[PDB]
């Protein structure tokens, strides 16, 4: 019965016609309910790969995936500001979320950051926060709602009932060569975030060797596609192209990135590239969330909550609300686990850093124990890199490539070989590039 209706929808898309909202939602729910077979899913996916989808179709697909599970509704809490979030294609050393949420919350936004785990070398935000003893990434949503109401930000992982149709849909795409389709990718990127019930959203689309899309042109095209769909779905959205040709923060790992985020919020250390990207993303959130009129007003408000400690305090109150220690901001080195062996790694040659393989550095952290080879693995939260050298730095015997935090000497030596191999020196200094490239609006 459903199989009959499904095949008509396939035939309709097969022949180049646009599907209706009602047909798209029927098919997405049949994927969710297992009333449409894998063959039929693959066939539809392949007709979309070939014929593409119009903007109304793309919007219907994303909203249907979004409506396939829980969608958070914030009206009853009567918050007096915008619900807003950031989404990213990810990167090594990208810890922006841990400062951005508190900074926007301190400026009057409400930031329900539902995120995830590792996924294949880039480090998941949830694993980083679990380096904090006691920190609880799975509050029940009455606690979640309370934290959003009281603190303005929470970072959690209750994702199971969010856009569940994407699960079966992606699984079939990934064995039938129908992953590589912009309308399907856009749906997968957006559905879970949109299920947060956002007023506004900023999308961070990486550019560079360490990016999800491999070329500048393809990053830009993906960002425009996301922006078009998200706004069509009723969420005020912009995107930034930002640089991932090297580690973004000065550290890569879990505990080490939490430490960097606290020091950024307090002013103890602000990596200038991480600062550029974080500030730029937060600006979009204030403008789209209607908390600031323009860039200069938004940057003033953001710099103010960095300067008077309010953003650091929101982070501290979030850590305490999610059951970490109440004095984490003041005493983070007491609570974050320390690796047994912390030792700088030096290059074999002298010269300038001209290039860096971020996927390889990310895999080096994973191999140290800082990430999961398999999902059943346990993370050592103390290991990783700090003091990362950057593109353009002078490297000699007195200037290390990084400080490696390792659980023992054997894994330290293995990480050092991987780091030295991932970083390319050259006799002449490279040219500089922006940390933030194009801002993309609808």
Ligand X SMILES: Nc1ccn([C@@H]2O[C@H](CO)[C@@H](O)[C@H]2O)c(=O)n1
8 Å CB contact between 42 and 48: no
Would you count residue 347 as binding ligand X (CB under 6 A)? no
Supply φ then ψ for residue 344, to 5 degrees.
Answer: -70, 150
* Closest approach of ligand X to the CB of residue 375, in Å: 5
| Position among 8, 22, 217, 307 found at the interface with a copy of itself (CB under 8 A) | 217
Count of CB atoms within 10 A of residue 161's CB?
A: 12
192 classed as catalytic: yes
Would you count residue 54 as binding a copy of itself (CB under 8 A)? yes
Would you count residue 160 as binding ligand X (CB under 6 A)? no
Q: With CB under 6 A, what is the number of residues at the site for ligand X?
A: 8
**Could you give the dihedral angle defined by the CA atoms of residues 223, 240, 92 and 166, in that order, rounded to the nearest 10 degrees?**
-40
* Closest approach of ligand X to the CB of residue 52, in Å: 5
Binding segment for a copy of itself among 258-266, 376-384, 394-402, 411-419 (CB under 8 A)? 376-384
Count of CB atoms within 10 A of residue 372's CB?
A: 17
Residue 301 neighbours by CB under 8 Å, 6+ apart: 107, 286, 291, 292
| Position among 182, 200, 203, 282 found at the interface with ligand X (CB under 6 A) | 182
133 binds, among ligand X, a copy of itself, none (CB under 5 to 8 A by kind): a copy of itself
442 binds, among a copy of itself, ligand X, none (CB under 5 to 8 A by kind): a copy of itself
Distances (CA, A) of 238 to 412, 423, 440: 42, 33, 6
86 classed as catalytic: yes
Three-class DSSP category at 241:
strand
Of the residues 173, 270, 273, 317, only one is catalytic, namely: 173
* Closest approach of ligand X to the CB of residue 369, in Å: 13
Of the residues 13, 58, 86, 206, only one is catalytic, namely: 86
| CA pseudo-torsion sign 375, 377, 383, 384 | negative
The DSSP letter of residue 49 is H
Distance in angstroms (rounded) separating the CA atoms of residues 284 and 100: 11
127 classed as catalytic: no
The smaller minimum CB distance to ligand X, of residues 193 and 273, is found at: 193
The smaller minimum CB distance to ligand X, of residues 105 and 129, is found at: 129
| Position among 7, 42, 51, 346 found at the interface with a copy of itself (CB under 8 A) | 51
Distance in angstroms (rounded) separating the CA atoms of residues 382 and 255: 5
Would you count residue 133 as binding ligand X (CB under 6 A)? no
Distance in angstroms (rounded) separating the CA atoms of residues 111 and 101: 6
CA nearest to 129, candidates 277, 255, 268, 227: 255
158 binds, among a copy of itself, ligand X, none (CB under 5 to 8 A by kind): a copy of itself
Distance in angstroms (rounded) separating the CA atoms of residues 345 and 347: 7
* Closest approach of ligand X to the CB of residue 382, in Å: 14
35 binds, among ligand X, a copy of itself, none (CB under 5 to 8 A by kind): a copy of itself
Residue 117 neighbours by CB under 8 Å, 6+ apart: 124, 126, 127, 157, 372
Binding mask 362-401 for ligand X (x = CB under 6 A): -------------xx-x-----------------------
CA nearest to 80, candidates 44, 48, 110: 110
Would you count residue 296 as binding ligand X (CB under 6 A)? no
CA nearest to 260, candidates 158, 403, 395, 138: 403
193 classed as catalytic: yes
Six token digits for residue 352: 């300038």
88 classed as catalytic: yes
- Interface with a copy of itself in residues 7-26 (CB under 8 A): 16
Q: What is the separation of C-alpha 305 from the centre of its chain, rounded to a whole number of angstroms? A: 23
Binding mask 132-151 for a copy of itself (x = CB under 8 A): -xx---x-x-----------
The smaller minimum CB distance to ligand X, of residues 33 and 442, is found at: 442
- Interface with ligand X in residues 207-266 (CB under 6 A): 221, 224-225
* Contacts made by residues 120-124, CB under 8 angstroms, sequence distance 24+: 121/92, 121/359, 121/362, 121/363, 121/366, 121/371, 122/90, 122/91, 122/92, 122/94, 122/362, 123/92, 123/252, 123/253, 123/254, 123/257, 123/362, 123/365, 123/370, 123/371
| Position among 3, 11, 22, 50 found at the interface with a copy of itself (CB under 8 A) | 50
Angle, CA 296 vertex, CA 295 and CA 302 arms, to 5°: 85
Would you count residue 179 as binding ligand X (CB under 6 A)? no
Q: Which residues bind ligand X (CB under 6 A)?
A: 52, 182, 221, 224-225, 375-376, 378
- Give the footprint of a copy of itself on this chain (CB under 8 A): 16, 32-35, 50-55, 58, 133-134, 138, 140, 157-161, 214-218, 220, 224-225, 227-228, 231, 335, 337, 374-378, 380, 431-432, 434, 440, 442
Catalytic residues: 85-88, 125, 173, 188, 192-193
């Amino acid at each position: 019965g459903s199989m009959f209706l499904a095949q008509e929808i396939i035939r309709k898309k097969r022949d180049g016609h646009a599907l209706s909202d009602e047909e798209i939602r029927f098919f997405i729910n049949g994927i969710r309910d297992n009333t449409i077979s894998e063959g039929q899913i693959a066939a539809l996916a392949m007709t979309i790969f070939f014929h593409d989808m119009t903007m109304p179709e793309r919007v219907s697909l994303t909203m249907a995936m979004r409506d396939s599970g829980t969608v958070l509704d914030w009206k009853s809490l009567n918050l007096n500001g915008p619900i807003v979030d950031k989404h990213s294609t990810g990167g090594v050393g990208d810890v922006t979320s841990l400062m951005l949420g508190p900074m926007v919350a301190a400026c009057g936004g409400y930031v329900p950051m539902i995120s995830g785990r590792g996924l294949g070398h880039t480090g998941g935000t949830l694993d980083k926060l679990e380096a904090i003893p006691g920190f609880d990434i799975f509050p029940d949503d009455n606690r979640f709602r309370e934290i959003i109401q009281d603190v303005g930000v929470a970072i959690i992982g209750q994702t199971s009932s969010l856009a569940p149709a994407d699960k079966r849909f992606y699984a079939t795409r990934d064995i039938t060569a129908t992953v590589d389709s912009i309308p399907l990718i856009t749906g997968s990127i957006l559905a879970k975030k949109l299920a947060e019930g956002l007023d506004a959203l900023v999308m961070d689309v990486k550019v560079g060797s360490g990016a999800f899309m491999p070329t500048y042109e393809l990053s830009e095209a993906l960002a425009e596609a996301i922006v078009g769909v998200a706004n069509g779905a009723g969420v005020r959205t912009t995107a930034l192209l930002t640089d991932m040709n090297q580690v973004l923060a000065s550290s890569a790992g879990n505990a080490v990135e939490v430490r960097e985020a606290v020091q950024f919020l307090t002013g103890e250390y602000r990596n200038p590239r991480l600062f550029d990207v974080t500030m730029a993303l937060c600006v979009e959130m204030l403008i789209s969330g209607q908390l600031a009129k323009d860039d200069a007003e938004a940057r003033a408000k953001l710099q103010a909550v960095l300067d008077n400690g309010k953003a650091a305090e929101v982070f501290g109150r979030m850590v305490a609300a999610q059951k970490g220690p109440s004095d984490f901001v003041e005493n983070y080195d007491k609570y974050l686990p320390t690796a047994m062996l912390s030792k700088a790694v030096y290059a074999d040659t002298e010269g300038f850093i001209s290039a860096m393989d971020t996927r390889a550095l990310g895999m080096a952290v994973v191999s140290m124990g800082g990430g999961r080879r398999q999902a059943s693995d346990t993370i050592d939260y103390s290991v990783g890199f700090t003091d990362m050298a950057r593109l353009g730095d002078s490297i000699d015997g007195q200037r290390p490539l990084a400080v490696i935090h390792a659980k023992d000497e054997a894994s330290w030596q293995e990480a050092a070989k991987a780091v030295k191999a991932a970083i390319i020196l050259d006799d002449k200094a490279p040219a500089s590039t922006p940390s933030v490239y194009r801002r993309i609006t609808e």
